[PDB]
Design a protein around this nucleic acid. Sequence first.
RNA 1: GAUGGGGAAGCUCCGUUUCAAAGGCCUGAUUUUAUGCAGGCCACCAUCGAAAGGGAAUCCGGUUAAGAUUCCGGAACCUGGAUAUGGAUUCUUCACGGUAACGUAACUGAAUGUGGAGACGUCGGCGCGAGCCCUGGGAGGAGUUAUCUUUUCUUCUUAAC
RNA 2: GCUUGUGACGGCCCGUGAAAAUCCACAGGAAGGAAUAGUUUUCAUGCCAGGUCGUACUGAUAACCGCAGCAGGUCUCCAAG
RNA 3: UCUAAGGGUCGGGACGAUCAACUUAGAACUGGUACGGACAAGGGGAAUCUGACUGUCUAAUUAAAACAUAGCAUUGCGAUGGUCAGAAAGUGAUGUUGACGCAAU
Lengths: 112, 77, 97, 252, 91, 135
Amino acid sequence: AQRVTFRRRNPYNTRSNKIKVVKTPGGILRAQHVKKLATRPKCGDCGSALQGISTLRPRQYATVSKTHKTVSRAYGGSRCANCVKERIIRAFLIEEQKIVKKVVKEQTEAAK
Amino acid sequence: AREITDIKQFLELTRRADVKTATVKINKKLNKAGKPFRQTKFKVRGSSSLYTLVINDAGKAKKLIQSLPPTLKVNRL
Amino acid sequence: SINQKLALVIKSGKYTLGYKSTVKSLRQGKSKLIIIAANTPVLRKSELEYYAMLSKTKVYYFQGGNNELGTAVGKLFRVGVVSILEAGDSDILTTLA
Amino acid sequence: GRVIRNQRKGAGSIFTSHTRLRQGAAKLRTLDYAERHGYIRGIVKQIVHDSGRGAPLAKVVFRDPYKYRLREEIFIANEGVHTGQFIYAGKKASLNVGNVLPLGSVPEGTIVSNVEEKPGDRGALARASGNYVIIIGHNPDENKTRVRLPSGAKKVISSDARGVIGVIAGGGRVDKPLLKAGRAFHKYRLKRNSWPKTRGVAMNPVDHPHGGGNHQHIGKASTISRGAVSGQKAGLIAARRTGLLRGSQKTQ
Amino acid sequence: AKRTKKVGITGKYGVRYGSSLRRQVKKLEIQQHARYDCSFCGKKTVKRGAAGIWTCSCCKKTVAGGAYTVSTAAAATVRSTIRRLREMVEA
Amino acid sequence: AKFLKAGKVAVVVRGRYAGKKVVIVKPHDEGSKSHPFGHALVAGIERYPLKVTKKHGAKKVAKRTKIKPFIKVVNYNHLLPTRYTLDVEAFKSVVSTETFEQPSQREEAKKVVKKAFEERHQAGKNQWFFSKLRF
RNA sequence: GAUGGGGAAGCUCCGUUUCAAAGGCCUGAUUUUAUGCAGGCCACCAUCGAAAGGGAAUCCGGUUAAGAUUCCGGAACCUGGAUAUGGAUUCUUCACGGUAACGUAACUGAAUGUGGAGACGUCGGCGCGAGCCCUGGGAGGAGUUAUCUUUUCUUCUUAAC
RNA sequence: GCUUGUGACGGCCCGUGAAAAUCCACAGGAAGGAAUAGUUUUCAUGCCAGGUCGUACUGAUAACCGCAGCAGGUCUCCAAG
RNA sequence: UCUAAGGGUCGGGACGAUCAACUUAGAACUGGUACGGACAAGGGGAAUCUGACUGUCUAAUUAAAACAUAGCAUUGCGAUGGUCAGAAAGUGAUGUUGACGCAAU
Ligand SMILES: CN[C@@H]1[C@@H](O)[C@@H](O[C@@H]2[C@@H](O)[C@H](O[C@H]3O[C@H](CN)CC[C@H]3N)[C@@H](N)C[C@H]2N)OC[C@]1(C)O
Ligand SMILES: CN[C@@H]1[C@@H](O)[C@@H](O[C@@H]2[C@@H](O)[C@H](O[C@H]3O[C@H](CN)CC[C@H]3N)[C@@H](N)C[C@H]2N)OC[C@]1(C)O
Ligand SMILES: [Mg+2]
Ligand SMILES: [Mg+2]
Ligand SMILES: [Mg+2]
Ligand SMILES: [Mg+2]
Ligand SMILES: [Mg+2]
Ligand SMILES: [Mg+2]
Ligand SMILES: [Mg+2]
Ligand SMILES: [Mg+2]
Ligand SMILES: [Mg+2]
Ligand SMILES: [Mg+2]
Ligand SMILES: [Mg+2]
Ligand SMILES: [Mg+2]
Ligand SMILES: [Mg+2]
Ligand SMILES: [Mg+2]
Ligand SMILES: [Mg+2]
Ligand SMILES: [Mg+2]
Ligand SMILES: [Mg+2]
Ligand SMILES: [Mg+2]
Ligand SMILES: [Mg+2]
Ligand SMILES: [Mg+2]
Ligand SMILES: [Mg+2]
Ligand SMILES: [Mg+2]
Ligand SMILES: [Mg+2]
Ligand SMILES: [Mg+2]
Ligand SMILES: [Mg+2]
Ligand SMILES: [Mg+2]
Ligand SMILES: [Mg+2]
Ligand SMILES: [Mg+2]
Ligand SMILES: [Mg+2]
Ligand SMILES: [Mg+2]
Ligand SMILES: [Mg+2]
Ligand SMILES: [Mg+2]
Ligand SMILES: [Mg+2]
Ligand SMILES: [Mg+2]
Ligand SMILES: [Mg+2]
Ligand SMILES: [Mg+2]
Ligand SMILES: [Mg+2]
Ligand SMILES: [Mg+2]
Ligand SMILES: [Mg+2]
Ligand SMILES: [Mg+2]
Ligand SMILES: [Mg+2]
Ligand SMILES: [Mg+2]
Ligand SMILES: [Mg+2]
Ligand SMILES: [Mg+2]
Ligand SMILES: [Mg+2]
Ligand SMILES: [Mg+2]
Ligand SMILES: [Mg+2]
Ligand SMILES: [Mg+2]
Ligand SMILES: [Mg+2]
Ligand SMILES: [Zn+2]
Ligand SMILES: [Zn+2]
């Protein structure tokens, strides 16, 4: 039955005025301003939300230790690792198949 | 803003550096199922955080109050 | 037809279906020949290719999709790669293959 | 007396294109050594919707020849171009849907899109959804190419001018009935302020030429000469004919 | 039970707009919503959004299509006249 | 054939060593009570040696040749067999079930594998194994 | 909307990266000495424009005739800067571990390139959270009580971090 | 249950629904770095600083606009049985 | 004043024990025949004229049959262009555009 008011001079229901309602040690209801829920980062290859990485808003990532912001494998805080596994097979196979094609020139060179 | 388990670490904290003041709280608390018991809380005011140690039984408590050095100004309750 | 050979391999012979198992075959070498559905991606092609050259297993490219090469084994789903384990009654590998 | 609506438009207070949401200005690669001599490869990264455009867009990233960096371009996606396809640019690229070749480097009968009017202008003709041009013959001496445009007119251009194989995606939009005003409303929300239109005869003669009268009527021939004057020109303007078109179209 | 004799997806427009236009739309709304087979992963998980743009539910392949259907007549009959045209310069 | 055998080089496809080339040593074709699955035992290269050039000085080359190894149990499924091969030799005894489970053996094992790889690298025997795979 | 510019008798009009020689930083090199020369970068070219858009960080209790997320008591947080001790790293120099997904109290990184977050419609049902609503036991307080009603009402709370 | 937040989904489009500051990370390998000891601030603990302007109250059948303590007009949050 | 149906959670060397709700239907009895008891809450039908429709306008005498719309048709234009702006410009709108486009009826 208690009714509550905003705590900041913005009266309007915008993104930045989100309000949690709370009961304090006083025993009364009081508004409290919530920030905007920060979004999980995305693998820059596939786009899926990449695990092992803490999800905060971007200037919070400067206040946190690095074992949050990467994971132990190459391209740790970047790609989703089935996509890095992709970069593994594809790299190797393409750099291999290159030699085959450099060989097969050296055949058709003097064998044409 | 932190709670402490280790009794030893607590001691190295009570003598630590910039810690000029501590405090000790005593609460009536009912043990386990039935009875009451004397709970005692050790609060050490650090330059950043207030570390606090809860000694459940008064035995470890009684001997720890002695473990507190002088020049640490300890408000009793 | 190249499809009808599989009809015999399937009833009278031994086979496995799908990439994860057709690598296990080529690794253990248990596969004589694997067949690839035309639409499957080239990274998987090169892999299944390169896994085969290391196992000295021939590979024929099925002209068609996975929903077809799956019907061609008489199974109601799609399959990209069939690994031929034990040739059946059919002539199979001794062929154009 | 007054200033008629089409007159007011060249000032562009309210009449400017509604531009905020648009992916960018869709253009070809700049013509450089690679394209005019060899080929160069890029992957279309994603294909995407432009606002106020009927055609989808392909974002195509290439590598920068003279500096290490990736240079992304905005192409009008021809139909069948897909994310992850490699696109090839310039003369020695092969002839496949989506690549970009000089007009000289294709045979006659090729159907090609976003072609330049002059070589290097980064593309002009047939950028609308579903449109395209056809090459009819070349003239290897003073290398020229004749092409049939979407309007049907045929044009001589330079064979160094490029254009991209295939047809633009998103063909068929103009068949589906708009079916109500809202669909027409939002259609022009993201275009420019053209809608709706008030009929010049519904107005008063200060407002329009067609304005005025105790009956709604035009009162003089609605066809207006080329040599007419600003605020005289509203109607069928320099019309060579008029009336319902009977018989076939498709000129020579 | 079957619900509408004729209108189908067009029953949304009720009585409005006249029957021709309603049907004339019905064809294209049914074309544009359909699930289509995917040239890549071989599944019927292709579907539209943003006319001219068709993606696969899985496999995430995305192809520039027709407005209300994936492959438009003029497209493929252009594409095959391209195939035939390069063979000339293959041979 | 069965390309899983001693000398074979592979590329690790996962697990923090991903992208680095390992040589197999002790393939266990089928399982174990711990690791019930087909797994090799590989001596890999973690930190590759760097590029060297005619103008690279005395200790510069003495620095740039150092090589950080690693010794890993690998699921076969997490290996990508390369056609290339490097003959095990000195580390046949080094890399074993016993070496793992206690660090003291791994550390010395890595020490051997260290001297092993550098020695084969200088005098560029098996050039591919020390050329970093880049992706 | 300044500027090199181009119009205009002129008040001024146009143009905002435009026919423009459009600069600013990281390090050394000084050991005349304070900062010239050595590089290699980067060429991205005013500025104004949101007290509802974007955005670094605080809460509870108490207090005034009137002020409070501003004072007071207590417990925090961000940013800029200074810095010392512990811990960690290494004779295999730049941490180990798990098959893997990943773990972690740390666990060097310049030019340059890339990736993510800033960062985004609407409607529908379905899941969950807080706060509000109803309510049983008991512990207090107040009301009704000719009759009735283990009854009516009320307190039973928990902030950021 | 009601307010509100959030999640995974589905419908809709010839509509497919901002920008920038900013912050983190990946790639790379310049360079610098140990043994009588060298390395580190993305771990812990500690030391200093945080200016300038606004902050009262009305916000409406009397504190605003309509000549007024005018039945008009003026954006929004909370919402018990 | 009753009856019936519609659930949760347990353990198994055929069911039992247990927690929790306000829906629905049915049956009795009962009354000054009353009962959506206040409040709340469509009048219905047949036709002619006219605009298809939702939408719009004369603030302060007109809300309509007038405007708009989807739809139908017609006209101009391939950029050295159409339409349109400025006293002029080395200036501008359409135009982040290109005939499935823009402009004019
Ligand atoms: C006692 N509280 C802390 C004290 O522990 C210490 O904390 C620093 C902290 O400020 C640094 O953090 C700071 O610097 C980072 C970049 N170097 C970015 C984030 C920023 N908060 C930490 N990286 C290291 C701590 N020892 O220095 C700052 C402080 C506030 O005095
Ligand atoms: C724009 N709405 C107008 C509204 O302004 C008003 O118009 C009157 C107009 O009729 C009166 O004018 C009338 O009477 C005048 C005196 N006999 C002469 C002109 C005649 N039109 C003028 N006094 C102006 C408006 N207040 O009433 C008529 C209207 C059309 O509704
Ligand atoms: Mg306030
Ligand atoms: Mg309050
Ligand atoms: Mg992590
Ligand atoms: Mg901190
Ligand atoms: Mg974590
Ligand atoms: Mg006039
Ligand atoms: Mg460009
Ligand atoms: Mg039509
Ligand atoms: Mg308008
Ligand atoms: Mg009209
Ligand atoms: Mg008209
Ligand atoms: Mg009139
Ligand atoms: Mg006139
Ligand atoms: Mg008239
Ligand atoms: Mg008329
Ligand atoms: Mg008329
Ligand atoms: Mg006239
Ligand atoms: Mg039906
Ligand atoms: Mg030299
Ligand atoms: Mg100016
Ligand atoms: Mg500003
Ligand atoms: Mg703001
Ligand atoms: Mg702030
Ligand atoms: Mg007050
Ligand atoms: Mg450690
Ligand atoms: Mg950078
Ligand atoms: Mg609301
Ligand atoms: Mg969307
Ligand atoms: Mg790195
Ligand atoms: Mg600690
Ligand atoms: Mg106030
Ligand atoms: Mg107030
Ligand atoms: Mg009033
Ligand atoms: Mg007043
Ligand atoms: Mg006044
Ligand atoms: Mg009755
Ligand atoms: Mg009645
Ligand atoms: Mg009546
Ligand atoms: Mg009636
Ligand atoms: Mg009407
Ligand atoms: Mg309505
Ligand atoms: Mg209006
Ligand atoms: Mg009126
Ligand atoms: Mg009306
Ligand atoms: Mg009609
Ligand atoms: Mg002219
Ligand atoms: Mg012109
Ligand atoms: Mg002209
Ligand atoms: Mg057409
Ligand atoms: Zn990924
Ligand atoms: Zn697919």
